[PDB]
Amino acid sequence: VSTLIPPKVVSSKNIGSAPNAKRIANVVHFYKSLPQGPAPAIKANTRLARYKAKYFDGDNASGKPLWHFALGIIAFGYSMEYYFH
Amino acid sequence: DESILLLTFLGFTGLVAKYLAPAYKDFADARMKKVSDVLNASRNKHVEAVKD
């Protein structure tokens, strides 16, 4: 007898599976995606964007800024020692 | 008197830079790698989902 009409009806496979949710996510995310992100920090300029760039970038974490930062406070109180003495 | 103390601090930063600063670099690197691998894994995963 005469075949039923379901095989030629589709209209809820688009909620029917899980990658639909991911699809509607990644059509927004990827379509308006940039090839590369914006920045790993770069502001501190006054001849100190260089200080941050050399020391406090993702390029390295090394003891050089620590030494520098320590020395600033040492220079304050060391001069003040002779202001107190 | 206090120049002896400042000398001790100079030594302290010397030991820190000798032992700790390369160790902390390696530690930080290790974690950074792990974060990155997970991130990139997620990117692969959604590429799979499109194909699915």
From Swiss-Prot, chain A:
Gene responsible for this protein: ATP17
Subunit structure of this chain's protein: F-type ATPases have 2 components, CF(1) - the catalytic core - and CF(0) - the membrane proton channel. In yeast, the dimeric form of ATP synthase consists of 17 polypeptides: alpha, beta, gamma, delta, epsilon, 4 (B), 5 (OSCP), 6 (A), 8, 9 (C), d, E (Tim11), f, g, h, i/j and k.
Purpose: Mitochondrial membrane ATP synthase (F(1)F(0) ATP synthase or Complex V) produces ATP from ADP in the presence of a proton gradient across the membrane which is generated by electron transport complexes of the respiratory chain. F-type ATPases consist of two structural domains, F(1) - containing the extramembraneous catalytic core and F(0) - containing the membrane proton channel, linked together by a central stalk and a peripheral stalk. During catalysis, ATP synthesis in the catalytic domain of F(1) is coupled via a rotary mechanism of the central stalk subunits to proton translocation.
Annotated compartments: Mitochondrion; Mitochondrion inner membrane
Protein source organism: Saccharomyces cerevisiae (strain ATCC 204508 / S288c)
Family, as annotated: Belongs to the ATPase F chain family.
GO CC field: mitochondrial inner membrane; mitochondrion; proton-transporting ATP synthase complex
Keywords: ATP synthesis, CF(0), Hydrogen ion transport, Ion transport, Membrane, Mitochondrion, Mitochondrion inner membrane, Transit peptide, Transport
Residues of the full protein shown: 7 to 91 of 101
Other remarks on this protein: Present with 14600 molecules/cell in log phase SD medium.
Protein name: ATP synthase subunit f, mitochondrial
Example of a GO biological process term: proton transmembrane transport
UniProtKB/Swiss-Prot annotation, chain B:
GO molecular function: proton transmembrane transporter activity
One GO BP: proton motive force-driven ATP synthesis
Localization annotation: Mitochondrion; Mitochondrion inner membrane
Annotated Gene Ontology cellular component terms: mitochondrial inner membrane; mitochondrion; proton-transporting ATP synthase complex
Coiled-coil intervals, chain numbering: none
Main localization of the protein described in the UniProt heading: mitochondrion
Keywords from the UniProt entry: CF(0), Hydrogen ion transport, Ion transport, Membrane, Mitochondrion, Mitochondrion inner membrane, Phosphoprotein, Transit peptide, Transport
Subunit structure: F-type ATPases have 2 components, CF(1) - the catalytic core - and CF(0) - the membrane proton channel. In yeast, the dimeric form of ATP synthase consists of 17 polypeptides: alpha, beta, gamma, delta, epsilon, 4 (B), 5 (OSCP), 6 (A), 8, 9 (C), d, E (Tim11), f, g, h, i/j and k.
Family to which the UniProt record says this protein belongs: Belongs to the eukaryotic ATPase B chain family.
Note: Present with 12900 molecules/cell in log phase SD medium.
Role: Mitochondrial membrane ATP synthase (F(1)F(0) ATP synthase or Complex V) produces ATP from ADP in the presence of a proton gradient across the membrane which is generated by electron transport complexes of the respiratory chain. F-type ATPases consist of two structural domains, F(1) - containing the extramembraneous catalytic core, and F(0) - containing the membrane proton channel, linked together by a central stalk and a peripheral stalk. During catalysis, ATP synthesis in the catalytic domain of F(1) is coupled via a rotary mechanism of the central stalk subunits to proton translocation.
Protein name as it appears in the record: ATP synthase subunit 4, mitochondrial
Native species: Saccharomyces cerevisiae (strain ATCC 204508 / S288c)
Whole-protein coverage range: 89 to 140 of 244
